[PDB]
Amino acid sequence: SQPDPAEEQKRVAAEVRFNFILFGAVIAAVRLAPIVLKH
Amino acid sequence: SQPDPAEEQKRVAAEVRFNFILFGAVIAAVRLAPIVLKH
Amino acid sequence: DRLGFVVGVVQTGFHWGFVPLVLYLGFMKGAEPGMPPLNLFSLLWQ
Amino acid sequence: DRLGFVVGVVQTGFHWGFVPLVLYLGFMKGAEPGMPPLNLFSLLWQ
Amino acid sequence: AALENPGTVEELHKKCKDIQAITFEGAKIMLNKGLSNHFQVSHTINMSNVVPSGYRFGATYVGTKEFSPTEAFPVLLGDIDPAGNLNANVIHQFSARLRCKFASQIQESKVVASQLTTDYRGSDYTLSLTVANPSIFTNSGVVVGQYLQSVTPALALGSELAYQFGPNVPGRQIAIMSVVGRYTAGSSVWSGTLGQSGLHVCYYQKASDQLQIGAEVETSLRMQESVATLAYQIDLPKANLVFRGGIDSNWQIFGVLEKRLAPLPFTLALSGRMNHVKNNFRLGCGLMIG
Amino acid sequence: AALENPGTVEELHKKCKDIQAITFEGAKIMLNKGLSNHFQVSHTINMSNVVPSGYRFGATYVGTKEFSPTEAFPVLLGDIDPAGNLNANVIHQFSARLRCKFASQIQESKVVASQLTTDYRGSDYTLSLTVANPSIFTNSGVVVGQYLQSVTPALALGSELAYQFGPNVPGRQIAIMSVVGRYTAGSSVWSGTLGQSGLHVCYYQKASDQLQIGAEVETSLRMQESVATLAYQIDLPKANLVFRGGIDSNWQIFGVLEKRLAPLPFTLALSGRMNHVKNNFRLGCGLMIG
Amino acid sequence: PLSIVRSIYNNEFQWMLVKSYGLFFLGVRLAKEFVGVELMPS
Amino acid sequence: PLSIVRSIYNNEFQWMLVKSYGLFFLGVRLAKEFVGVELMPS
Amino acid sequence: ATVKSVKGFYSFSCNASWIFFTSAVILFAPVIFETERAQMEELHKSQ
Amino acid sequence: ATVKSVKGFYSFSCNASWIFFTSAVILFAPVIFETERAQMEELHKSQ
Ligand SMILES: CCCCCCCCCCCC(=O)OC[C@H](COP(=O)(O)OCC[N+](C)(C)C)OC(=O)CCCCCCCCCCC
Ligand SMILES: CCCCCCCCCCCC(=O)OC[C@H](COP(=O)(O)OCC[N+](C)(C)C)OC(=O)CCCCCCCCCCC
Ligand SMILES: CCCCCCCCCCCC(=O)OC[C@H](COP(=O)(O)OCC[N+](C)(C)C)OC(=O)CCCCCCCCCCC
Ligand SMILES: CCCCCCCCCCCC(=O)OC[C@H](COP(=O)(O)OCC[N+](C)(C)C)OC(=O)CCCCCCCCCCC
Ligand SMILES: CCCCCCCCCCCC(=O)OC[C@H](COP(=O)(O)OCC[N+](C)(C)C)OC(=O)CCCCCCCCCCC
């Protein structure tokens, strides 16, 4: 009856985009970090 | 009916003693050879 | 396919031509201006 | 058998005793008369 | 302010792989001939009991009028065996900052592995993007984003995101973010990376010009496998000698002696690896002629 | 008249086996310690990939008050591994004539091979008798009679009769008479033996102290198998170097370097055998310390 | 505690971890001691 | 004579003989030429 | 079983010495050999 | 089949060169290397 067990596959895709935003956020953090540390 | 195929075995023994007398004869020959060669 | 052929062609050209290309650019420069020419014997032995 | 036992005994004595025998005759002679004694450390270190 | 450029994420993970010894097995001969400072040719003969024996022929070209620095780009290097298996590397500088490397390995008349890498350098930071093993006909392939910034003159921090698509990946796409950092503490350069899966940490310790020591740990959180190494290098120009040897936490022990034999530019390498798990020892020896 | 003693039949058959190289596989370490001119101890460590790898401990004793010459008999020499496999040799002199050698190899707690040999050295001739691998409980074993006489100062001739008894022999007893000779005009020395069942010939030739060349053929008339070798030795004290290498008519090629490293009594040994039939190379390296 | 520690030694990953982190930190101790060492000194 | 000589080459012992006596006599020819040779001469 | 226990300790201590001495022959000994030889060379050169 | 005949000759030329050069690397080359190095050492010593 199921068309596809898509949910696990799309949740993995959701975690992939979550990894992307986390990768960006850590770059944003370190891009702020030296000012925050020297401030 | 045969007691033993002894003939081949005893012929090998005969050749073994033949090797012994040949070994002796070549020693006897070389023991004579230098005299024969200087003679 | 246009790429179906061109990709195999270009990769075959890289595959066989890269060492030919390095050698060609080498003999294009040659030796130093004061050195004897790079005869192909210099590829074959010291 | 007399030899059935004595042969195995004597070969076992050779087997384990030959290196013991060589070592014993060595330490019997020892070093040269002017050299330090052959302490058993001579078997173990340079 | 006025920080260094930190390098690149691959140079942190390689940071302690330079002193780790590279053992080889069997007899290997290499002859190098410098035809010009732009053009070099190398003939290498590999005889081994278990490594595939054979000749391979190598040539290198470098330098063109476009590129000013002593790096003397482009670099155009490749070596091929009589069976036709090609290894080749290409390196380019779209500018003084943006640098590019390309490498491809062909065997069985097929490209078995390839990667294209881009490396960009700022006064305080580095950014790089890599693509590798691409399908040309399909979306499938490997992609890696990497970032690294100097945060204090003794400390750098950064980030990495590897990605893959297609049938080689268990999920149709997967990616792994992983933090990265390095702390210098003078000699005691710490390095490592913490992933959403896996961890790696170098320790590196230059004792002196004559002695360099490092250590590693690796770990994987979905694969449940981990290893470590302790490795050292000795450099002895007083003895025309270098030695790299290290213990493996899987109890391989390796040492790769190499001697330069004279001012005459022969070097002799002796390679020993003992697998103490298997009581197995693999010897290699080889001569390099400059 | 007053000819040389010709040596013994085993020295003819060995005549060209001294320059034939003895290759080895893997890494072998040997330490020799001289405890006195009568007593020497040697520790040998062999790490090897397929050759059995381990340790064995060796000791040698020589000389007693009975024996005057610089040979300093008796000789009493043996080396044992921690598994208990013993190799040992015994040599004795009932006089200057009637020298005796004994050797036995014990492994798996069993005598696997042994021989006892006499030499009688009779001015212009030699006579020798050997017994080997004897059963003690049964008549079975090996016997060899050998004779060799100098016939002219350039030429020697002789004879040999090997014999065996028992289940190891296909006939209940077998023996093979075989003539032997040697000729020595100029630098060249010929040698060989003609048997009822085989033939062997050395050719040997000193070119100079730096270069010695020999060749072999072997043949068997009941086994239908034959081989040959061409082998040479280079001695280069200027290079602290000796090299033995030869072609085998089964197309193995072998070379065994040894380098004395210094007045300090290390010698490196480098052993290469390539089986060109199997394209198979076996490397060995080893260090002897005097 | 052999009833405890053997339960690690018996288990591959937990032991692989202990081995790897052990030799690593041993390397850290050794390295921090080695910092003054030279083999054929100036 | 390839019909003749191949009948030897095809047969193991006969070829083993030819190889062994061949390389042997080649060694004799070489050795009788090498008699004057030195490698790092005095 | 005391003798068998001694055979146990022996075979263990034999193996332990094997692993140690083979490892040293790889890791340290090549350095020791060349460093010693270089030191004796310097000694003879300075002697 | 000319190309295939050239592939035949070529692969034979591989074997012939392979067997020759691997053999020389065993039999002769170790002598050549050390003899050359000793001669260059004598040259530099005499220079
Ligand atoms: C004394 C100082 C100077 C010395 C100078 C030495 C020069 C090098 C001598 C040969 C070395 C050697 O070993 O070559 C050996 C090779 C053949 O080996 P292979 O095919 O691997 O054999 C094993 C076969 N497999 C691999 C299938 C298992 O021969 C050759 O065909 C190369 C000869 C040199 C030609 C260079 C151009 C090659 C272009 C190849 C394009 C595909
Ligand atoms: C991890 C390893 C474990 C195994 C044991 C290691 C022992 C370590 C030894 C250290 C010393 C050392 O390597 O020396 C190697 C020596 C160097 O000394 P030299 O020749 O006198 O030159 C220096 C002169 N000096 C000593 C006065 C300073 O060069 C050789 O032999 C050269 C060999 C050339 C041939 C190479 C092989 C070619 C292929 C195969 C041919 C059959
Ligand atoms: C660096 C200085 C300190 C050295 C301390 C060494 C302690 C060794 C304890 C062994 C525990 C162990 O591993 O025992 C278990 C091992 C075997 O299993 P495994 O190794 O897990 O292999 C399985 C791997 N898997 C998990 C991936 C499947 O047993 C053995 O037969 C091998 C023991 C080899 C010891 C080598 C020691 C080298 C010392 C070098 C010194 C110069
Ligand atoms: C500079 C050093 C050069 C070394 C050259 C080595 C060549 C090795 C080739 C192996 C091929 C092979 O397979 O050889 C073996 C087979 C023959 O035996 P088979 O038919 O397999 O029967 C099974 C084996 N039996 C018969 C023992 C049971 O072929 C040959 O004998 C043909 C090879 C001829 C080589 C000629 C070389 C001439 C050299 C002259 C300078 C000394
Ligand atoms: C039966 C009577 C034996 C008498 C022995 C007397 C000698 C005692 C010495 C220890 C022997 C031992 O214990 O060595 C044990 C081991 C070998 O063990 P293995 O089991 O063969 O290893 C292989 C395992 N196999 C059997 C399953 C395949 O070798 C060693 O570690 C080498 C010891 C080298 C000592 C060097 C001393 C000199 C150093 C100079 C300065 C650097």
Side-chain angles (χ1 to χ4, degrees), chain F residues 250-251 253 276-277, chain H residues 9 12 15-16 19 23 26, chain J residues 19 23:
Chain F
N250 191 249
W251 308 129
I253 282 179
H276 293 289
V277 183
Chain H
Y9 182 93
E12 299 168 36
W15 184 227
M16 286 277 264
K19 284 167 45 180
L23 178 63
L26 178 65
Chain J
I19 284 173
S23 300

Side-chain angles (χ1 to χ4, degrees), chain E residues 25-27 47-49 53 268 270 274 279-285, chain F residues 25-27 47-49 53 268 270 274 279-285:
Chain E
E25 171 178 359
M47 301 166 282
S48 188
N49 203 355
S53 298
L268 184 81
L270 278 158
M274 191 156 187
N279 192 39
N280 176 263
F281 175 87
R282 319 200 78 80
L283 185 66
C285 184
Chain F
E25 175 192 293
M47 300 152 285
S48 199
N49 201 355
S53 177
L268 261 184
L270 267 161
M274 187 162 188
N279 193 32
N280 179 276
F281 190 107
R282 314 195 81 85
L283 184 65
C285 183

Side-chain angles (χ1 to χ4, degrees), chain E residues 255-273:
Chain E
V256 180
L257 176 291
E258 68 173 56
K259 281 286 300 190
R260 186 178 297 274
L261 304 186
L264 192 68
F266 294 87
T267 79
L268 184 81
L270 278 158
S271 162
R273 174 171 293 269

Side-chain angles (χ1 to χ4, degrees), chain E residues 95-254:
Chain E
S95 72
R97 289 179 171 189
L98 175 55
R99 189 182 306 218
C100 179
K101 284 185 173 80
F102 171 86
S104 187
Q105 178 167 243
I106 291 148
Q107 67 173 18
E108 201 170 317
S109 192
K110 198 71 176 183
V111 178
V112 296
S114 62
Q115 67 87 358
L116 176 66
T117 285
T118 73
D119 187 280
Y120 176 75
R121 189 187 191 274
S123 305
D124 313 273
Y125 80 103
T126 289
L127 204 163
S128 167
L129 170 62
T130 294
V131 186
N133 306 333
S135 179
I136 297 170
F137 313 111
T138 301
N139 307 71
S140 54
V142 180
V143 187
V144 191
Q146 304 180 119
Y147 182 98
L148 181 72
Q149 171 156 17
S150 298
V151 176
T152 306
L155 167 69
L157 293 176
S159 186
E160 158 187 332
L161 185 151
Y163 175 105
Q164 299 86 3
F165 187 104
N168 64 301
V169 195
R172 301 181 190 278
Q173 61 178 338
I174 291 187
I176 44 168
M177 162 55 181
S178 59
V179 187
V180 189
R182 169 173 56 65
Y183 178 55
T184 298
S187 172
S188 304
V189 184
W190 290 88
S191 307
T193 179
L194 297 91
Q196 306 313 132
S197 174
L199 175 146
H200 162 257
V201 180
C202 285
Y203 184 81
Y204 172 98
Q205 188 98 73
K206 185 180 174 184
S208 184
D209 292 347
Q210 295 190 349
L211 174 61
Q212 316 175 52
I213 295 157
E216 293 194 343
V217 61
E218 293 188 308
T219 286
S220 65
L221 269 53
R222 198 176 184 93
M223 165 169 65
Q224 273 54 46
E225 192 161 46
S226 297
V227 303
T229 67
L230 159 59
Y232 81 89
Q233 174 166 306
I234 281 177
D235 297 85
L236 286 169
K238 289 191 174 190
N240 290 307
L241 163 65
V242 170
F243 182 96
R244 281 178 278 273
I247 309 97
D248 188 313
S249 181
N250 195 33
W251 308 131
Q252 293 73 27
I253 286 183
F254 45 74

